[PDB]
Amino acid sequence: AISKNLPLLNNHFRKHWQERVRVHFDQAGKKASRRQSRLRKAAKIAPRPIDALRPVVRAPTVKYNRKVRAGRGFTLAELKAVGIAPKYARTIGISVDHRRQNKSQETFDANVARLQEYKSKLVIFDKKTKASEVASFEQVDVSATFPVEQPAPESGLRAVEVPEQTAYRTLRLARNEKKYKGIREKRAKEKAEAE
Amino acid sequence: GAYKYLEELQRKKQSDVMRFLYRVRCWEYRQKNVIHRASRPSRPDKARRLGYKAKQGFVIYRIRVRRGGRKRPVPKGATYGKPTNQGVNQLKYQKSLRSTAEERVGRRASNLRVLNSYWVNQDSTYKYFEVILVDPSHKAIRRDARYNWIVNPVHKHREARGLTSAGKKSRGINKGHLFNKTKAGRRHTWKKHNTLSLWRYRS
Amino acid sequence: KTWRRWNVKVNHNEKRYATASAIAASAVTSLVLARGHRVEQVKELPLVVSNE
Amino acid sequence: NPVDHPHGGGNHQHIGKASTISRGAVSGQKAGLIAARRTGLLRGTQ
Amino acid sequence: PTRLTKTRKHRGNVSAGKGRIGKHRKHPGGRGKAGGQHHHRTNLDKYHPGYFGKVGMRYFHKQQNHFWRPEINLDKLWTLVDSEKKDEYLSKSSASAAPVIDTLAHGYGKVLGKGRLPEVPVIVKARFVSKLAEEKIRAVGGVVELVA
Amino acid sequence: AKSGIAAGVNKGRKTTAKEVAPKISYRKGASSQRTVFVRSIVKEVAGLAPYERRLIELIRNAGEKRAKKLAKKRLGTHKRALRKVEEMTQVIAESRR
RNA sequence: GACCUCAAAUCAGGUAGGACUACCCGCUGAACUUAAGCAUAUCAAUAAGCGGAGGAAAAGAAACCAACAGGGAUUGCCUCAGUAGCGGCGAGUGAAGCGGCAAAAGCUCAAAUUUGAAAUCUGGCGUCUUUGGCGUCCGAGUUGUAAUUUGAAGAAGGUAUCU
RNA sequence: GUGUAAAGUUCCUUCGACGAGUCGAGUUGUUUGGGAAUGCAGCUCUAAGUGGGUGGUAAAUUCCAUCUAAAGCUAAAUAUUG
RNA sequence: CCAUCGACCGAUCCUGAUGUGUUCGGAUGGAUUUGAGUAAGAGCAUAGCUGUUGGGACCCGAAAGAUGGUGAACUAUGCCUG
RNA sequence: AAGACCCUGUUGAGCUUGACUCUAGUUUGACAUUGUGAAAAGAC
Ligand SMILES: CN[C@@H]1[C@@H](O)[C@@H](O[C@@H]2[C@@H](O)[C@H](O[C@H]3O[C@H]([C@@H](C)O)[C@@H](O)[C@H](O)[C@H]3N)[C@@H](N)C[C@H]2N)OC[C@]1(C)O
Ligand SMILES: CN[C@@H]1[C@@H](O)[C@@H](O[C@@H]2[C@@H](O)[C@H](O[C@H]3O[C@H]([C@@H](C)O)[C@@H](O)[C@H](O)[C@H]3N)[C@@H](N)C[C@H]2N)OC[C@]1(C)O
Ligand SMILES: [NH3+]CCC[NH2+]CCCC[NH2+]CCC[NH3+]
């Protein structure tokens, strides 16, 4: 059962695994049909775009802080700042997210900017609009026309400015302050109250 | 109105007034059939909160259900296997008494759809429930835009499939890390986690 | 069984290498004749013909 | 034979344990003298 | 392919290469890692010491993202400068105009100190830094700027 | 608000803060003039539960710690026991005035 | 003469049952087997047994995830990861958050005095331009049927002219 | 067009009802990767109103964060030896 | 590439500077100790033979165990009518 | 007729018991079902 110098393995095949095997023989067929569905859906509503406009959000988790991605929908405050009611925004290709909040300024500004760009490029037709102007427009890809752009990292040239305390010492002191904060402020009280 | 007062009063189940009412009504319910039609809800505010309306086509049934656990129904207590499976007493049914009440009432009134249910009373032998029922075939239901949905055949015997409030409770259908196993259906999630997924170009 | 391995992955760069090598081979008359093509009465390879 | 009765079997016919059975014994065990207060020939008054 | 296997070469030989005495049988010795403490101890103690037992403390609900901190050493740090302006930066960089290196935006958590820098001032932005890494950066006239 | 470095207390990047209008859902626990009125009437109609009466008597006899152990067993948690004991002492205080 | 509760009718009109098995929602539930023995464990929350659907079902617009510069209904794929963890800590077993992608869609009640007017609804009868419209008469309904609100709010008083 | 009507947007004032033998707790059995207890169910106890739940080591003390249960509907991407 | 004496990083034992939330900090120098480390990267991917582990697992073979059904036309025993 | 005797196998089964580990049933207590009065002892 156990023999010569080999890695010890973990092959989980002790249940009736052969009753539950999924082979994606239909990978190409599903690609083609998913493509045909996109085609039909786009032809149904032309020239209106298929994709609603989406916000730009920071990814959570200290591993993904640096990145920014597409979110679910614009906040109520972001829409308020551009003068668009939430129930009206849904009828003009703008996504809405009542759950996301705007605690800071940067993301709010970026999404207000996206909304203003989209509103500047938007043309709402009405009963007066003729078929010849409706035929003038091509179905625009919204996620390509309003892409999520990573802010560029700082580069180039700048003056060198050396603080007297090292970065390493700053980090060590910050760790020490955090670590002993609770017991030091307990000592501060019990010494004070005894005064 | 009065419904708020009834709501707050029904939360005082140990006051003298409520203890008296529960005693008298438990005796009365225990005198009638195990399943009987109720001419009206005994808790109209509670029934309203669960979807009842005082319209034609809304029906209330009462049922008592025997309390306690599930004795394993094996002859003479013999289970014929390993000691881990030898238990007969102290075993528990995985569905609640409320769901049993719903299912038995649904079996009796098979022309109707079970909407929801609520507790009404309790003694040491029985728990008493009232089951709210809707008639799919009544025009007062079929023409009502707030209740048309239950006419669709996908809601046939939703109480037998664990689709009522009590059923979705017992199935563990809730959001978050405490319901990882049952969130999307326990057996579906197990099947997904126990499926070997092979692609054409095997990585 | 259906879950036998049917398709095979090839590195994309190596596949491009083979494509380039096969294109280069098409300009070698000895290789084209060995391959069995009746290119005895063509002046030069590659054979390029006008866009008409 | 032993399958049939608690008294069955053996290379002679004999009961092999006390025939007085507890009142608290279970079905399949109550054969013999069930919860006997005494045994043997009755002598004297009762 | 099957035509290249030794099964083809064993055709016509009785035991298929498995021996007449030993006789390839079903599971002599048990299945899997059976007997790791009994009749396979001579394998496990030789080739997998440490296999049996418990060491250290448990960590319930460990989230690996808390511990993300990819490391970059000083000998590699100039790869992060734009490749088209690296030659120019090596010549023109001074105390008043030095290249900025945003290590976190390049996906790194800590600057370690293996290797040698070009003798050119740089400005290094990092979440964490080792003591020697900062010391070598300051020695060529540079600085480490902590970011979060 | 954040320190601007990756370690220590109050760590993290500094952003320009923006004030957020509180969500209406955050008011859930607040009492209203409707509910306070109705609950006071129901208490008059209903009266106290048997453990509540038994809990008054403990507090009147200066058995705070003894009333707290009973309230924790009856209600289940020490947090809920504390609130019920405070509630019942306000029941006694009003009774005298 | 009402009412409440409870009955009967070959009363007027409806409705349910049974079938099929690949997939679906639950209940109930093994042992062979592995552990080189074996009882916890494993096989397996599997087979068999029972109840209930559809073209999909189920789930679903947070009593969520997180701990970040924060994400934002549900579902699936890839990854996380054979990892954290569980385990005679043996044999074995084993998810989730983040990240990329497919697809994207949102909402409804209860709790509120219409109170200057039950404004609501099934049925019968007549009629028409009949998946229904109109008129009328019983009946249901105040122990609450409509309109109005659903937390992202929203209501009652004002508001600015707008749209 | 029965539009002195229905709706939307902005500002100001006062308000802002929000689901109970349920939540939650103990215990028993079962199950889970969930470990001083993951879900489910039985029995006993049984709430509150800035309250309640969660925050993966039991407890008390003080904070913080995040949602808003115990009522309900809903296409698509997913499955498919019929 | 090999033998050997060192140097560097982490764990362990000692030492303990300027300083201090006076209990933290850890400069500097040591130690028959320890690591699946460093000391001018070698890996990633596809394929092939052989070898390994889980799978029906080279092929055929138990005595057994479990779940759900079908039989008192033979025969055992009671009852009813001849 | 792949010994039915004998031995071996970490292969069984029928049977037994003061084997190991359990179990139907039964018995004993507590809590609930569960209310209304009075008296005597005890307790704060
Ligand atoms: C602290 N005292 C040290 C003593 O420990 C020793 O140093 C060892 C050294 O020999 C080890 O190094 C040893 O092992 C490594 C191996 C791990 O790769 C080899 O590369 C190296 O050639 C070999 N000498 C090194 N890994 C740790 C030091 N403390 O060297 C003598 C000494 C100075 O007295
Ligand atoms: C030319 N410079 C060399 C440098 O290349 C390097 O040499 C290593 C040498 O130290 C290693 O060898 C080392 O490590 C091995 C290892 C098995 O533990 C030890 O057995 C050996 O004693 C030790 N010297 C050798 N395996 C590779 C060379 N490139 O380190 C030593 C050096 C002199 O600085
Ligand atoms: N499919 C397996 C059914 C039996 N369940 C046992 C697995 C979990 C055993 N408890 C693990 C230890 C308790 N945390």
B29/A20 Cα distance (integer angstroms)? 51
- Residue A67: closest CA among C51, B190, F44, E107: E107
Q: Which two tokens stand for residue E137?
A: 């950066």
Q: Which of residues 119-148 of B touch strand G (CB under 7 A)?
A: 137-140, 143-144, 146
A166 touches strand I (CB under 7 A): no
Q: Are E69 and E128 in contact (CB under 8 A)?
A: yes
Q: How open is the CA angle E144-E148-F6, to the nearest 5 degrees?
A: 90
Per-residue exposure over C17-45, b if at least 16 CB sit within 10 Å of its own CB, e if not: eeeeeeeeeeeeeeebeeeeeeeeeeeee
- Residue B114: closest CA among B58, B63, B168, B65: B58
E15: how many CB neighbours lie within 10 A of its CB? Answer: 12
Q: Which residues of B touch F46 (CB under 8 A)?
A: 9, 12, 15, 17-18
What does the DSSP 8-state code read for residue A6? -
Start-to-end Cα distance in chain C: 52
- CB-based contacts of B151, cutoff 8 Å, min separation 6: B136, B141, B142
Q: Which residue is nearest to nucleotide G47 (CA to C1')?
A: A16
Q: Are B177 and B166 in contact (CB under 8 A)?
A: no
**H helical segments located in C1-52:** 12-25, 29-34
Q: Which two tokens stand for residue D5?
A: 């009765």
Chains C, D in contact, 3 or more Cβ pairs below 8 Å? no
Q: Provide the residue type at B160 as one letter.
A: A
B164/B103 Cα distance (integer angstroms)? 10
Strand boundaries in chain B, DSSP class E: 35-38, 58-66, 113-122, 126-134, 196-198
CA of B97 to the centre of ligand 3 (A): 26
B24: how many CB neighbours lie within 10 A of its CB? Answer: 10
> Is B194 in Cβ contact with A24 (below 8 Å)?
no
> Is B14 in Cβ contact with F49 (below 8 Å)?
yes
Among B15, B17, B18, B21, most F C-beta atoms within 10 A, so best to mutate, is B15
E104/F4 Cα distance (integer angstroms)? 14
Nearest chain F Cα to A62, which residue? F12
> Judging by DSSP bridges, how do beta strands E110-112 and E128-129 pair with one another?
parallel
Q: Which of residues 117-146 of A touch strand G (CB under 7 A)?
A: none
Q: Which two tokens stand for residue A27?
A: 């990978």
From the CA of A68, how many Å to the nearest CA of chain B? Answer: 25
Per-residue exposure over F40-69, b if at least 16 CB sit within 10 Å of its own CB, e if not: eebeeebebbeebeebbebbeeeeeeebbe
- The dihedral through the CA atoms of F51, F55, F58, F63 has a sign that is positive
Asked if C7 has any chain A CB less than 8 Å from its own CB, the reply is no
Cis peptide before C46 (omega within 30 of 0): yes
E36/E44 Cα distance (integer angstroms)? 7
- Residue A54: closest CA among A31, A71, A67: A71
- CB-based contacts of A52, cutoff 8 Å, min separation 6: A73, A93, A94, A95, A142
Q: Are E100 and E80 in contact (CB under 8 A)?
A: no
> Judging by DSSP bridges, how do beta strands B35-38 and A157-158 pair with one another?
unpaired
F52/F63 Cα distance (integer angstroms)? 14
Q: Which of residues 9-38 of C touch strand I (CB under 7 A)?
A: 9-11
Residue F17 host element (H or E): none
E11/E6 Cα distance (integer angstroms)? 9
Between the CA of residue B74 and those of A6, B80, B143, what are the distances in Å? 50, 10, 50
Backbone conformation region of residue F4, classed left if phi is above 0, alpha if psi is from -120 to 50, else beta = left
